[PDB]
Design goal:
Chain B: This is Portal protein. The structure is cut from a larger assembly and holds 5 copies of chain A and 1 copy of chain B. By secondary structure, chain A is α+β, with helices and mostly antiparallel strands. Chain A is about 30% helix and about 25% strand. Chain B has 3 helices and 2 strands; from the N terminus they run H-H-E-H-E. The chains are: A alpha+beta, B alpha+beta.
């Protein structure tokens, strides 16, 4: 993950210890993951997610890079994983013929997904730049003059990794 | 009745029937304008040169204008 | 055409040799002719033109001053130039009876067209002024301050010598 | 005609010899005559003009002050000059009954026309003023500051002597 | 690809080691490829692609320069590459008779695509300029005054290498 | 072609060797040729181009000055070159009667085309000026003050040599 060592020296110089830097990092990552709707961090192996019932032919999982899926259980009964159609880019599961359950809390899916640190390089750079901008931070006093939304500030850099709202 | 007939006949002697009105960009040489008008008349005249496409140089305008054929009708008084 | 001695001495002073001045004149002349679509100042005689068939009654030569036509060959068969009506101002030819062909590259026209150096006096002046202005070249440094398209630049002075695009 | 002597002393003082002044005069007169569509200079006796076929009842000659006409030949056959109707102000020739030829290069007319130097006095003044303005000619350097279309520049002064474009 | 020695020395001077320069290059390249949707400068050969079934007549590979296709396997059954029409500029494949499948993750394509370092000269220059500008970074303090999105920044120079969103 | 010697002395003075100047020249030419859609450089003899199937009566080759064509092969079978209609200005090939193939990768045409250095003089001037502007390159520091799209920057000078997008 992102450690205070990976921050630039000048930005870290505005701190006192790695604890507060890690706290700020955690806050920024939490905000980014909440806004984009899914974590872009290193791939989490066998993450367990519970999904409500879509009711259609395709299940829109909350991911944009789905590598593999281990087991799928619906309404207390396990399904055959090999009989489903999965799209890596879309991150959706499609039954061959039929419809998914339309009830809440009926689908539990465990799968491996995410972007690895090798491919996801601009994500860490964007997080680091946002942390530095937050740390560094009309009013005139003598020869010193300064002249002057969370959602807009995030969207200015995190647009490519945001899942569109469900219709 | 005689005056009505005279007025209705006078339309074919002093009346203009325009089809297209072309408005030209001011930054144009008159000779080039005449040459372009001649080319337009050559490409879009007659029943043979029908249902084609008209390309206009930038800054120009074309509008379609009919006539007033329903003004020489004095049936309700004749 | 135009030679470096025709340029003002002050404009002449910014070029290492007359060859550089001739190169600048050639570039400006090429740009002006490309914008206009035909030469203006020199009277090229017996000019050979390969034009496409319009298929209509009038053929439109790419000239605005047609002095005389030498010979016309269409589809390998030469026509009688004395039976074709000529328009010096419009630079067009009309067949009294019949229509021109419609295929591509079927008409070869040899004719003399253009203005002489006598009447074509504003063209040379415009070319010289354009060359001088292009060779004459907010930012403030101490007491020296400066504050600030080919289509717009050429449309300033070269408008009267343009053939409008063919409809 | 307009000689460099008729220029004001101050404007001519920005030249070196009468040759370049005459060249500039010729360029300005050529541009003005091209833009207005007809020469406004002293009356040219027996000027020979070839006109294309209008096809209507009136022939719109390219002049605004037609004094007299010598001979008119149409399609190789001379007409009777005394049987035509001519308007000095309009500069148009009207056949009594019939229509003109509609073919190109069919009418050759020789006539005396123009404005004499006595009546045309503001024309020379406008030409002289335009020449002087061209010769005399944001950028700030120390205490010296300067802050800043051919067709518009001409039309600003030459409007009364311009022939409207043919419809 | 691009190495730190390719960067100008002045740009090179702001990084502690070549590893930091390579990290910046990797981040910028990742952002540019994510915006464009495919690699440009390196010729990856035998690239393996897992694509979804469009169900139509033409299949759209995520490339804009298709050199050659090695093998095509659809739904576990390999097709004949010699019977499929190829479009180098569009990067698309058309079945002469029949339609592609419509299920997700049913086509595996192995092909060589991209530009070589010879012609792809503006891509490297744009990447270098972007890296330099990002690494070059109202407020007034004494005589020093400064006055002031990823989408807008990347759209400035990377527009020609974009695949438009699939309809 | 364009060598660093043809650059002005002042612009070349901002470089260190001919290698980087040639690299910048190559980048600028690549960008210009990509934007305009076809190379305007010296005529390439017997260039081999593969074209997709138009499906109509005329084949729109990606050129604006086509001098001659050597051989045309369609669907593996060579055609008779002398039986086609070619337009130098349009750069299009027209079959006498019939239609072209509508399939992809079916037409291979070898032809001589382009603009020679004699006629194409403003192209090199525009390239040189763009290179110089790129090389030379609000912020105020003491008495020094500065106040401030690739497609627009290119289109400002390269408009006359751009092929319109295919409908």
């Amino acid at each position: 993950e992102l450690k205070p060592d990976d921050l630039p020296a000048k930005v870290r110089g505005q701190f006192a210890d790695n604890t507060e830097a890690q706290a700020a990092i955690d806050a920024v990552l939490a905000a980014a993951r909440r806004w984009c709707g899914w974590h872009v961090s290193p791939v989490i192996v066998d993450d367990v997610m519970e999904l409500d019932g879509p009711g259609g032919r395709v299940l829109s999982l909350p991911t944009l890079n789905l590598v593999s899926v281990s087991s799928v259980v619906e309404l207390g009964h396990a399904l055959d994983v090999s009989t489903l159609d999965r799209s890596r880019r879309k991150g959706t599961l499609t039954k061959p013929y039929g419809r998914w359950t339309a009830r809440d809390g009926a689908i539990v899916v465990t799968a491996t997904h995410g972007f690895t640190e090798a491919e996801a390089a601009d994500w860490r750079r964007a997080v680091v730049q946002l942390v530095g901008q937050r740390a560094q931070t009309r009013k005139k006093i003598d020869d010193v003059e300064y002249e002057w939304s969370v959602d807009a500030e995030l969207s200015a850099v995190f647009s490519p990794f945001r899942i569109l709202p469900s219709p | 009745d005689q005056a009505m007939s005279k007025h209705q006949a006078k339309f074919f002697d002093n009346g203009a029937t325009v089809n297209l009105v072309i408005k030209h960009n001011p930054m144009a040489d008159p000779a080039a304008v005449k040459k372009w008008a001649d080319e337009v008349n050559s490409k879009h005249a007659g029943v043979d040169n029908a249902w084609k496409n008209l390309n206009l140089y930038p800054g120009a305008d074309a509008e379609v204008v009919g006539s007033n054929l329903q003004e020489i009708d004095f049936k309700n008084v004749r």
